[PDB]
């Protein structure tokens, strides 16, 4: 959803 984490 866009997070790289």
């Amino acid at each position, epitope marked *: *959803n*866009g*997070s*790289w*984490h």
Partner: antibody, heavy 121, light 108 residues
Framework: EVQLVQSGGGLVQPGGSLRLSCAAS????????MSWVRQAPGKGLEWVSA????????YYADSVKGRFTISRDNSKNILYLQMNSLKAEDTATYYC??????????????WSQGTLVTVSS | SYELTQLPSLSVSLGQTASITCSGD??????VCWYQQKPGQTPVLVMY???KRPSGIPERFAGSNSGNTATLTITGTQAMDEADYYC??????????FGGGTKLTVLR
């Protein structure tokens, strides 16, 4: 169609600064993490930096941490890489890439054309 | 720092099967993807999540990731498959990690 068009590059002196940019279209830009990947002449691919979709989190390879800054403008659909304190070791073809992340699965599905950065006096 | 091992070169006869390997300790426990890079060109994703082919990639390309090695196989190798192939994964010690790349040479 997905497009990533890179700008910037060329010659820069050791210790100098250079900014690359990546213009995106054909997808919801803010929904994707983005990254910079580089390749020294005749060498392999090396991940450089990433930024989350929102711009809230940035990540850097140990080789560039503290010298580079990644940022993005979600209204203009542009990603930036400000490179400072450049070294001969940073000479490479740089690519911007769209990342798909599910932290276990990370991959780059679309890539820009590369731009060559030469660090020389 | 976590490392991915690829042989720098692999030779295959035209029309034969190429098996490009990528090894790493926890490899079978991780998700691996593959890129094809033709000389002086932008890399192209050819395989993701070990075995999934992006749209437009020929069925001749197949991926597997079992045990300590991830393998990209190419059947009926064509001159159009001549390229450098890179495997890539993730690890906590390096974030995104690439293999050194394997140059596929076609024997004629």
């Amino acid at each position: 169609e997905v497009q990533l068009v890179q700008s910037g590059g060329g010659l820069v002196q050791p210790g100098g600064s250079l900014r690359l940019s990546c213009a995106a279209s054909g997808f919801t830009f803010s929904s994707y993490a983005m990254s910079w990947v580089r390749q020294a002449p005749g060498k392999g691919l090396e991940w450089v930096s990433a930024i989350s979709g929102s711009g809230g989190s940035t990540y850097y390879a140990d080789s560039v941490k503290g010298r580079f800054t990644i940022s993005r403008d979600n209204s203009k659909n542009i990603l930036y890489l400000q490179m400072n304190s450049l070294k001969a070791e940073d000479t490479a073809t740089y690519y911007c890439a769209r990342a798909v992340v599910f932290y276990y699965s990370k991959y780059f599905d679309y890539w820009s054309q590369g731009t060559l950065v030469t660090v020389s006096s | 720092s976590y490392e991915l091992t690829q042989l720098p070169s692999l030779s295959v006869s035209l029309g034969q099967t190429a098996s490009i390997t990528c090894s790493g300790d926890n490899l079978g426990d991780k998700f691996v993807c593959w890129y094809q890079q033709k000389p002086g060109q932008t890399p192209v994703l050819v395989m993701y999540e070990d075995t999934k082919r992006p749209s437009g990639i020929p069925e001749r390309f197949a991926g597997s990731n079992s045990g300590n090695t991830a393998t990209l196989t190419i059947t009926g190798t064509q001159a159009m498959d001549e390229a450098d192939y890179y495997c890539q994964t993730w690890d906590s010690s390096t974030d995104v990690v690439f293999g050194g790349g394997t140059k596929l040479t076609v024997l004629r």
